[PDB]
Amino acid sequence: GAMNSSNYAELFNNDIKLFVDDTNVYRVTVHKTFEGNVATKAINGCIFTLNPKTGHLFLKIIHTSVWAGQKRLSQLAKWKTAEEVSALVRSLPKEEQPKQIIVTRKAMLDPLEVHMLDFPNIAIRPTELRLPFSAAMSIDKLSDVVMKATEPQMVLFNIYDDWLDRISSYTAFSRLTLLLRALKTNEESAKMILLSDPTITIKSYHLWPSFTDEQWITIESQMRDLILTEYGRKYNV
Amino acid sequence: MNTVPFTSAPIEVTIGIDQYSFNVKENQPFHGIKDIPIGHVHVIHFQHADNSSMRYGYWFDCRMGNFYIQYDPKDGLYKMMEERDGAKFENIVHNFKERQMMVSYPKIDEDDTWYNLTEFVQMDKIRKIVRKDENQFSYVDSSMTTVQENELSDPAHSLNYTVINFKSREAIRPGHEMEDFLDKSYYLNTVMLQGIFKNSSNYFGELQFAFLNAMFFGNYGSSLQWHAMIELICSSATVPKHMLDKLDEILYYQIKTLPEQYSDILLNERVWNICLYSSFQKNSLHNTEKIMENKYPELL
After folding, report:
1. Domain tally, chain B
2. Pair type for strands A153-158 and A56-62
3. Whose CA, among A66, A184, B77, B225, lies 20 to 30 Å from A42?
4. Are B95 and B161 found together in one domain?
5. Quick one: B56 and B120 in the same domain?
6. Does residue B167 sit at the A interface (CB-CB below 8 Å)?
């Protein structure tokens, strides 16, 4: 059934699993028309498909052309997500196929179950975790490849950079979720914290800066402070 | 007008005959049911006074043979049997009628209720759902599971309803996943009607049989089948106009007959709300919507 705080270590066991987050698939700007009505303009999106043990990110870029002449786009977006995850699974060798796919939003369960009927032994699960994967488009290199795309494209990343050389996948996932929660709560302040010292750069082949172990502890503290500083505003507590 | 004689009534029992029912006392001089209308299937059903558990009964059609009921003190139930000796049977029935030891099937002349509940139900189709080929009648009870309930355990004692599963390769064409899931017309018209049932009459017969087993025996698997066959039509954007008009009539009489006090266990809130208020057919079931809103406005 549902993935929660009680079964959290399951994410880092040796059973291949993927998280699927559809919150950036269908993206729009809302604007006024000449006549004073409201209209939407789609912008490029992405499916965020992540192996939390290895950091492998399958970023399927959703080009605005896939919406052309379609109706009920927020419904279609869930089905298009499930179609592309199903296509990704079928593209992987059998020994790389996931045993479980965890969807971040319950509305993805039926679309994905129906697209994966051919894979009765892949478990499709919801989660009670509130994961900040919507903030993926606050990672500059991911936002850049999505916005520049002129056609559908899959790009592969490691969202943990080289962290697994020094830390476990539990710790790497906790660092990623803290970074993304900070970027989601106050993007400007999080990016300031990540790039305030120009002597620490992002390698060409990385997403995040090349922090030493001691620098990651300082960064992680600064992100927790940012999250509590912001919470002390929202709720006036 | 046909007769189902009883050898005796050694145990106190509530006896159902179609939508009617009568109490018989332990060792009451009761010798059966006469004036049963020819042309319809019928069901004769039992609930013992001392163990209301296991409602059970027999579907039969008096055109197919001479049937009687005899209590079996070993198996502890009223059993239907066939008498192959026409002259013995005619002689038994004449004697019991002469002594007025039989209840009369109490049909009001104006009253089409039983026809309206069994319009598409055929004994030959019942005998394929309920497999006991050596008898011309069919035993059903409260506890019997469906082939579908068994997949998700004795195969000989199962209700072989047609398996309907909205999230199944049968229901969903590769490449039409969203289309087939949100509009079940493919599944209804090609797979079920053209493929398995051959025509709407057989589909309605099974739907009507499922409802009657749900209502008369509290058979849970039958209730699931009845709602699945309603939901499959209501969830299809493309249904022939004659089938929609007939379904409205079918459901109207079923809702009319349902005991008011069993609505809570016999009606699925989600299916009826979806069918009447959200589905493609939300505006196609005028008679059904009106009786449901007036009789069961709590469920909706």
Report:
1. 2
2. antiparallel
3. A184
4. no
5. yes
6. yes
